[PDB]
């Protein structure tokens, strides 16, 4: 599910739980990769996930 | 053979020796009514290209608020 950052950048996301043993959660504003030219071995940039 | 109404004729021959040879020729008439007539055996790819110049309009007088 998507959401957005408010005046304080807070997001209160709720998830009902009726599922398996362990749940993994992740949140991102960009995708799971350093989108602009990450594979060179001479790069300097990142985006926390 | 390329025949054109304004008495403009042209001929070309294609054989295995000039298999990949490209035979280019100009077309000088603005009005085009070119008729292609091919005979014999073998396929032939005919590519035609035409070119000109435009944009002498698009200068009107609408409101546009100055």
């Amino acid at each position: 599910s998507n959401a957005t950052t408010d005046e304080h950048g807070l997001v209160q996301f709720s998830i009902n739980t009726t599922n398996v043993m362990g749940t993994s959660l992740t949140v991102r504003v960009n995708y799971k990769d350093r989108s602009p030219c990450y594979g060179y071995q001479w790069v300097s940039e990142e985006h926390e996930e | 053979t390329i025949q054109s109404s304004g008495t403009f004729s042209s001929k070309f021959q294609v054989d295995n020796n000039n298999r990949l040879l490209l035979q280019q020729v100009s077309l000088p008439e603005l009005p085009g009514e070119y008729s292609m007539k091919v005979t014999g055996e073998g396929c032939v790819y005919l590519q035609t290209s035409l070119k000109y110049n435009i944009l002498p309009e698009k200068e009107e007088f609408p409101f546009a608020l100055g």
């Binding site: - | 085009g32 014999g40 396929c43 032939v44 790819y45 035609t48 035409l50 000109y52 435009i54």
Partner: protein
Amino acid sequence: AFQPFFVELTMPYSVIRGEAFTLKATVLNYLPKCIRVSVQLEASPAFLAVPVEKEQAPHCICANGRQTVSWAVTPKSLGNVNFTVSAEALESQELCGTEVPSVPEHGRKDTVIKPLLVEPEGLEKETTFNSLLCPSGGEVSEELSLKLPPNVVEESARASVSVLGDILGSAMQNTQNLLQMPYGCGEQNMVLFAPN
């Protein structure tokens, strides 16, 4: 080669019939004497040129001395067009320097004739057509009607046809280039096997 006193021009290879442009004509003097020059250009009716500093008369140019003038010109004709530039020395004008003999050879005036190219005005554009006529032991025909004269300019319409047989344009390299030795796993084995 060389010339003790010459006049060389500068302009690009091609221009447009509509817009205008400047023609830069320079004159170089290598003789020790300093002489005033009368530089001008004979123009044809195929265009229209106007000077920019014609009222002021040149002063003089000594050894290794060069001067330059310009002309705002606009072309009218199409294709290659001749431009003539005539430059010469003058006598009895000892106003710039001390003396001015001004006595060159019989060809004391450099009359250079240089051509320039001009394309038809307006935004250029194209149109294409293609066909595959395959007479398999008989006769075949086709008719191509070329007609696109909306808001166009005369003589800009050019057309051309090309007859060929193109399965050989790229037939040469890759056929020669591939054929390799099979090896590796099943996947790689097929990769190197199937293309052959």
